[PDB]
Amino acid sequence: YETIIVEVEDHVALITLNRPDALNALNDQLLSELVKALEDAQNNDKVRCIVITGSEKAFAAGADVFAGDLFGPEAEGIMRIRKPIIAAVSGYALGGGCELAMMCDFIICSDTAKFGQPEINLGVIAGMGGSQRLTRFIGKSKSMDMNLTGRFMDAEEAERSGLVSRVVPAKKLMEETMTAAQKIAEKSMIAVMAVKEAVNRSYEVPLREGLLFERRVFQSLF
Amino acid sequence: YETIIVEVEDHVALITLNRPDALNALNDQLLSELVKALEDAQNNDKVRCIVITGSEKAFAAGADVFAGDLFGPEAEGIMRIRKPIIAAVSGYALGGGCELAMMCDFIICSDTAKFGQPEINLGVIAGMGGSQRLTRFIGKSKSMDMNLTGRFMDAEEAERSGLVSRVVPAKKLMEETMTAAQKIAEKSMIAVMAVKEAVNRSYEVPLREGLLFERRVFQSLF
Amino acid sequence: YETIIVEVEDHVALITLNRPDALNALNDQLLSELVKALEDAQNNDKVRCIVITGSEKAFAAGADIKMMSEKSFVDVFAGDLFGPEAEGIMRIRKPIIAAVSGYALGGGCELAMMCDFIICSDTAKFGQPEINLGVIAGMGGSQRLTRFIGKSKSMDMNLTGRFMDAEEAERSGLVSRVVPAKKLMEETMTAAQKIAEKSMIAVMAVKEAVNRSYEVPLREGLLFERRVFQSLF
Amino acid sequence: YETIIVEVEDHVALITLNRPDALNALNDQLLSELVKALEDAQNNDKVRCIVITGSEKAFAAGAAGDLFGPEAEGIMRIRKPIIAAVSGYALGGGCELAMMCDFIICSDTAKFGQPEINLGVIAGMGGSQRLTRFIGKSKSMDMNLTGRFMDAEEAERSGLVSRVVPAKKLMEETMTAAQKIAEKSMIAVMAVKEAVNRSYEVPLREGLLFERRVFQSLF
Amino acid sequence: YETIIVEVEDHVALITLNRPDALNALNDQLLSELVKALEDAQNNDKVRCIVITGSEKAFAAGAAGDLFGPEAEGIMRIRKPIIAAVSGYALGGGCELAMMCDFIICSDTAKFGQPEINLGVIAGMGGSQRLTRFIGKSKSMDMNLTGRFMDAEEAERSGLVSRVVPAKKLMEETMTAAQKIAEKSMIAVMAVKEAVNRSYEVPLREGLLFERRVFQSLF
Amino acid sequence: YETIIVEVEDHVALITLNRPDALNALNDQLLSELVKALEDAQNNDKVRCIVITGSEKAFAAGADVFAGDLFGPEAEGIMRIRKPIIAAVSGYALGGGCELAMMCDFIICSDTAKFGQPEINLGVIAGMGGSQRLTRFIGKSKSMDMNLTGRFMDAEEAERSGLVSRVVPAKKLMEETMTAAQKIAEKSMIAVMAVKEAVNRSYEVPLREGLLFERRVFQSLF
């Protein structure tokens, strides 16, 4: 790989974005390699949890069209992974970088994390879920504000609003995340995949139907 | 009843879970008696609000299958109650106990409350809404984390994330809760049932349709 | 206008509710003028962002009881009480910021939630006390509150009528920003000017895409968003 | 039961509405006893398929407390399959009961309709919902607004019923279908019914996922 | 009006599209006048049912600013019922207008289609949405992709229309239906139409709750 | 390919199922080759419309599971194709073969066509959309009947119920289908993809939202 680093240590695959010259901004090559790295991790029977991270400075600072379906296949590639993916976010996670963090299953971030959707500054909009996942996760006011004004959201507000699960000091981010990934790697792999799928039903079906789906999956784990 | 205590005063039915040796864990008998007590309260024209609580130590610490539809009819019994149900949560509300609290209309909890969904530790998953209600109420990151790692959530995080409405000191929990229940009992019973049903549409229909439902129900109160 | 004031400056239409004797309670006249003013702002190519505010004491302290009294079911159903007014606000394609100070209660809380986002002062108090009158929220208080802040707090507010202060509103996601009372309008007009600096097509597209979040499954919302993103080319 | 007859043979429960002098109009007693007999059939390990029918003249010709709520919910919660064998009139609540069943076999004399509008009310047990989803907006709007009847051949052509047979073959056709269903795996049959019913509650993409997960669990 | 004719008689408003030289094709002015006439009929306490029709030759043969949005919203907001009486061509915009009405009665000369693909665009007023939901994926996909026509017999067989009658009976059949609707409670008629239209917006379980609550309020 | 034949002529890719001794039953090899042929047709800028057909006798007469997601990847490969696919059905289209015909964008069939879902006879159910697409396309009674009893549906009933668009004599099936495919090949490729995508929204979103999506796609075709 030329834009990412992949390390497999004791059932956890760690994928580190590696474009320091561009503060880990997404591009065609990085997105292509990331999806490949994720697909290899999914097919690797030893991998039980995935972690995506960037640098202390930036998780990822930013990033015809209809026939090529720009941004479609990459989003699909990540969403198809059945194993869990934790985003470990330090510093900037902006634009596509914020959207990548929200596509992961949950976020653990450092107290320096800064989130934002500044696409409007370029005359376009979020194109990988910034108008959709942000709103569902943190509520209309904050998502509308962020998407319309481009304002940033700090780690404390991110935790307070439900964008992230845990905030820890920058020096403890990787320790917190790998401990969580290890703990997930201790669980039944079938149950882990079922949990992820059931949780993700929450944004696709009426609650009454999501309860039925959950109960049938629960019963099948017997 | 053998596993619960029921007291009706001033239009409030207080249902207390009473399995102290199991820390109020939900079993067949308790769920069966709980549903019966709720149905009696629904059919009791003197009851205007229901409260469910456990002990100071635990609200509730935890909880063939296809043909018997394990956990289906119990959940449906609780969800069909039209009168409002407040959960007064002290100490542990884990697994099925967390799920019961989330099935109530809102939660008031003490500062000692601890929530969690540790079903994954047994190779199964939440089977009474833990993957559905938790996600919809507090957002993807915290619900994914809780369901995948089994981590607990303390009272302060529960209020900050929207899982509970109010947190009060341990010694004020029942005073705070009963005063809320008595405020509800002062209101029109028809309007209270309409309120609860309208709010619950929020997780079943698109917003445009929920707005139409609310307005038609509002009009019917004339 | 009799009950509101409209001032356009730097591509921002500021609409100020002006029934101070009544703490800016909504009534038939105010709602009619408000919707007219929003439609004018929508058709005004000078306007790129809208701001609604009340007084320092009250954004809007409720809805006038006379809007509902003296009416039968046939009246309110055949007339579709509160339907046209809500639809008139929701159809506006330009963004609307609510600058909330003091009381935003009942219909006034619902108005703030129909806006695209809220900036409030640290004196703001929100609530849905309709249940105190034997009725319920009729302009989205049972729907938007629940979806934005979660079931527990919405159920509690709609059933008990309890208030929510500015700090809890921000912590629960009801509002985007809380500032001191002295900076409320400066914070809000600066955000509105920032929005007015952007492409008007992209701004309307952002607002429409965000609002899909409450109408379609996420998978379909993602498809809609990507097709609109692509159409901006 | 005073108003219904229940007969169990070859793992099929035949439930006959027994108010023929009222053309099997659904009153409080019939509806209560119908739900009770359905619940008994569900809890009866010998029953694997259910059939509901009325008389040759009428399947069922018309009809805080949540009026009509509990009855509809009681029918909808039955997990075993229910076939409606419809002869003659199926009107109002009777048409709605037929549509609540999993599918309809009807005789060529069957007549469907929703004439609730004639009384100043509307369908209150699914006539505005199931009819529209099953046969399309034009015919459902027309039936609900004008009260017009739909005959057996139009019912099959529009998808309201699955099969039309001569009046003298109705029970033979239906009991043969029901007996065949009752020979199948009970778990798979309940799974089939549940998956099919997802079609009206979830987006197709999600219904596909549900169906595939249920299919897999049958392993 | 310059593009339409409006006649009110015996509680029925008849709106006739009148662009003979364009075979009643929809344009800015016609849609503007149609919405205005519909809104006047909504506000006219004398009108209880609306009918839209064109000529014997054509119902309607075709068609930042949100092109085609506000007019569609204006038609969809009408609470009183609207019957489309379709003779001859109902194509493109004209097929979409007919589907936006509450139900269709058509002559045996009616011809439906969505030929927008021929111009390098697509249906823009519901032809990809209502057609599919009313008649099924296969025929809607075929019609929208190939531009093929659908005759009156196929329209009734597939559920696109409620009734097909001879050309000379179209207006009599339609005005009789409109008169029957005008005999009913206006509150119940508005409720019925709104309940039926829930069928395409909510899960069935929720549509049933909505219907039951509106039914109960009609007391 | 070993189980299918693929021929591109005049912007139409004809894919013929070719397991005649098995009456074109779907197996792992055929589904793998079919998906490959579809993806190649999608990436082939000369292809504007796809046709799938079998033999005169049968289109297709029939055909660990959770971790491998049995039948998921195959269904998803067919559904992601953006160009249109016509099913030309003669003779038997049963089980997985009926489901394959329903996954295509529309069906033209001969008067000898026979459809059915006999999975229930094996103790399983439809696992590739037979419980979902059949019901949505032709109504609850006929779908419930077919799925519970395994009864066949003949060509006339298929057209009458909306399962197929057109029925023609056996000798005219391929002529009718290729002429339809040529008509589609004459159209704008971007508008053809938009039509198919807009039509398919009909089964995923509320009608009001599908109208919004349709109008925005219509506008962008400018």
Residue numbers in the entry:
A (entry chain C), B (entry chain B), F (entry chain D): 3 to 65, 77 to 235
C (entry chain A): 3 to 235
D (entry chain E), E (entry chain F): 3 to 65, 80 to 235
What did the published study say regarding this structure?
In acrylate metabolism and detoxification, AcuH is functional in both the AcuN-AcuK pathway and the PrpE-AcuI pathway. It can catalyze acryloyl-CoA hydration in the AcuN-AcuK pathway and the branching of the PrpE-AcuI pathway. Conserved domain analysis suggests that RdAcuH belongs to the crotonase superfamily (1.07e-74) and is predicted as an enoyl-CoA hydratase (6.64e-150). The activity assay results showed that RdAcuH has acryloyl-CoA hydratase activity and can catalyze acryloyl-CoA to 3-HP-CoA.
With the enoyl-CoA hydratase from R. norvegicus as a model, the structure of RdAcuH was solved at the resolution of 1.9 Å. The overall structure of RdAcuH is a dimer of trimers in an asymmetric unit of the crystal, in which three monomers associate end to end to form a tight trimer, and two trimers associate back to back to form a dimmer. There are few strong interactions between these two trimers. Thus, the dimer should result from crystal packing. Each RdAcuH subunit contains two domains, an N-terminal domain (NTD) and a C-terminal domain (CTD). The NTD adopts a typical spiral crotonase fold which is organized by two perpendicular β-sheets. There are three active centers in each trimer and each active center is located between the NTD of a subunit and the CTD of the neighboring subunit. Because RdAcuH and the enoyl-CoA hydratase from R. norvegicus have high similarity in their sequences and structures, we found that the corresponding residues of these two glutamates in RdAcuH are Glu112 and Glu132 according to the sequence and structure alignment. Biochemical analysis showed that mutations on each of the glutamates to alanine resulted in the inactivation of RdAcuH. Like the enoyl-CoA hydratase from R. norvegicus, there should be a water molecule in the position of the acetic acid molecule that acts as a catalytic water, and the carboxylates of Glu112 and Glu132 are expected to be ionized under a neutral condition.
